[PDB]
Amino acid sequence: SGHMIWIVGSGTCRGQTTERAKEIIERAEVIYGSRRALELAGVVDDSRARILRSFKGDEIRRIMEEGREREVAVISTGDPMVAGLGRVLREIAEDVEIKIEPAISSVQVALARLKVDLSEVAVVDCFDAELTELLKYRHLLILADSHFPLERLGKRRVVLLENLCMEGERIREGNADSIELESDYTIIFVEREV
Amino acid sequence: SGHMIWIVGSGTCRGQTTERAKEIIERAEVIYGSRRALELAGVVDDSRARILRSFKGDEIRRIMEEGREREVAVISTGDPMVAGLGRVLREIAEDVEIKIEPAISSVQVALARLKVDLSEVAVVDCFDAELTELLKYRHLLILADSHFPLERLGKRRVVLLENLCMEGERIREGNADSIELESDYTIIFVEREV
Numbered sequence: 001s002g003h004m005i006w007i008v009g010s011g012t013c014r015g016q017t018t019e020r021a022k023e024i025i026e027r028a029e030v031i032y033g034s035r036r037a038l039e040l041a042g043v044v045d046d047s048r049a050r051i052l053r054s055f056k057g058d059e060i061r062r063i064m065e066e067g068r069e070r071e072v073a074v075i076s077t078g079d080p081m082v083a084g085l086g087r088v089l090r091e092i093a094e095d096v097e098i099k100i101e102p103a104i105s106s107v108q109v110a111l112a113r114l115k116v117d118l119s120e121v122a123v124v125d126c127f128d129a130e131l132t133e134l135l136k137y138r139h140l141l142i143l144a145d146s147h148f149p150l151e152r153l154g155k156r157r158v159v160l161l162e163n164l165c166m167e168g169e170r171i172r173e174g175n176a177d178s179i180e181l182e183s184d185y186t187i188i189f190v191e192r193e194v
Numbered sequence: 195s196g197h198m199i200w201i202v203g204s205g206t207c208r209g210q211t212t213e214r215a216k217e218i219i220e221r222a223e224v225i226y227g228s229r230r231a232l233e234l235a236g237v238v239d240d241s242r243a244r245i246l247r248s249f250k251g252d253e254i255r256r257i258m259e260e261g262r263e264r265e266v267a268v269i270s271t272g273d274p275m276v277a278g279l280g281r282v283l284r285e286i287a288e289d290v291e292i293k294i295e296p297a298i299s300s301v302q303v304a305l306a307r308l309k310v311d312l313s314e315v316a317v318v319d320c321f322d323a324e325l326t327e328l329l330k331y332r333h334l335l336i337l338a339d340s341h342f343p344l345e346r347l348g349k350r351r352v353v354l355l356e357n358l359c360m361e362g363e364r365i366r367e368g369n370a371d372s373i374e375l376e377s378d379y380t381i382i383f384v385e386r387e388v
């Protein structure tokens with residue numbers, strides 16, 4: 001009921017928002033989120049919308065407390081529990097309650113393009129052991145940006161899924177040592193060395 | 195356009211279907227799916243709906259070929275690429291094309307209840323090395339049914355998320371050796387032994 005905010009996913013592609021997400025959004029008094037998240041959810045031009053610049057603890061704490069006086073909704077791109085706010089949330093002394101509303105992630109869109117099951121991979125957010133180890137039992141699905149060190153991947157065949165569902169969507173294939181990254185919205189698929 | 199079927203997710207909870215899923219569904223000439231998947235998507239009483247009993251290769255091959263003459267849609271519970279048809283699809287000599295439309299999985303709903311990121315776990319579909327190995331770098335999120343051998347898990351603390359978003363939804367906590375499973379819709383959360 002009260003003394004709590006919602007963190008809702010905006011989805012990845014247009015028309016991926018859920019009936020529950022819209023209801024939560026429709027009721028909110030103030031909506032926080034990055035411009036992409038707001039745009040995606042179709043509320044970047046709403047008057048209740050505040051575009052977030054930062055996403056650190058301090059900034060989420062502010063939003064958090066304001067949620068005691070008013071109904072707050074935070075929109076995250078894609079799915080909230082995929083390379084989302086989880087981590088910093090654990091660092092916040094929880095007075096107000098927080099509830100998560102799932103949405104479709106770039107991870108799901110990529111898996112759908114590849115015809116690969118989630119139980120066949122390990123989702124990585126952008127280690128040493130995360131290479132040989134995980135690759136021993138799983139393909140890797142890495143959420144990367146243009147600064148991902150491909151080095152750290154050898155001569156392995158990789159599939160780059162760029163800007164899924166965006167104007168410049170591209171799927172490329174090649175070897176980590178001879179392919180260049182160019183988009184900050186890049187999912188890197190690495191088949192398990194079986 | 196043609197010579198291809200869609201496999202769409204019905205979601206997990208009511209109101210989790212996407213605008214694209216509905217459009218695909220609204221256009222379909224024949225709809226296949228298990229009763230839960232059809233019920234969830236709100237089409238179990240549609241005249242175009244055929245409730246699936248089996249989900250083996252032979253049965254999907256049939257549906258597949260019928261998709262050459264008519265517009266076919268197959269609805270999977272939750273998300274299609276989570277413990278879905280991926281595996282048997284790889285065993286089918288692909289004439290007709292298949293496209294996947296993502297939906298919200300029980301995996302996402304569980305992660306949202308736990309406030310845990312997908313990049314922090316390994317999703318398991320119901321091994322020896324899948325225990326100590328994966329648990330060395332990830333929590334485990336196991337999609338289980340009432341026959342999951344808890345043995346195969348020791349004295350580890352586990353969290354059981356049962357019937358998420360269903361009448362009998364329950365979240366229980368305990369040790370694998372002293373807790374009993376009772377639902378075929380059970381997600382088993384095992385924190386990484388860190």
Ligand SMILES: Nc1ncnc2c1ncn2[C@@H]1O[C@H](CSCC[C@H](N)C(=O)O)[C@@H](O)[C@H]1O
Nearest residue numbers: 077078079082083105106143144163164185
């Ligand atoms: N449209 C897109 N196409 C490809 N990758 C994307 C993407 N959107 C996000 N990503 C990946 O996701 C990363 C951001 S972390 C945010 C992910 C989001 N919450 C979700 O569930 O999708 C990016 O660095 C990129 O690797």
Ligand SMILES: Nc1ncnc2c1ncn2[C@@H]1O[C@H](CSCC[C@H](N)C(=O)O)[C@@H](O)[C@H]1O
Nearest residue numbers: 271272273276277299300337338357358379
């Ligand atoms: N409502 C629910 N609550 C808890 N677990 C569920 C569930 N629905 C499905 N499951 C899990 O999913 C398994 C079926 S495999 C099908 C999963 C579905 N495609 C999805 O994306 O959710 C069950 O054995 C159970 O472990």
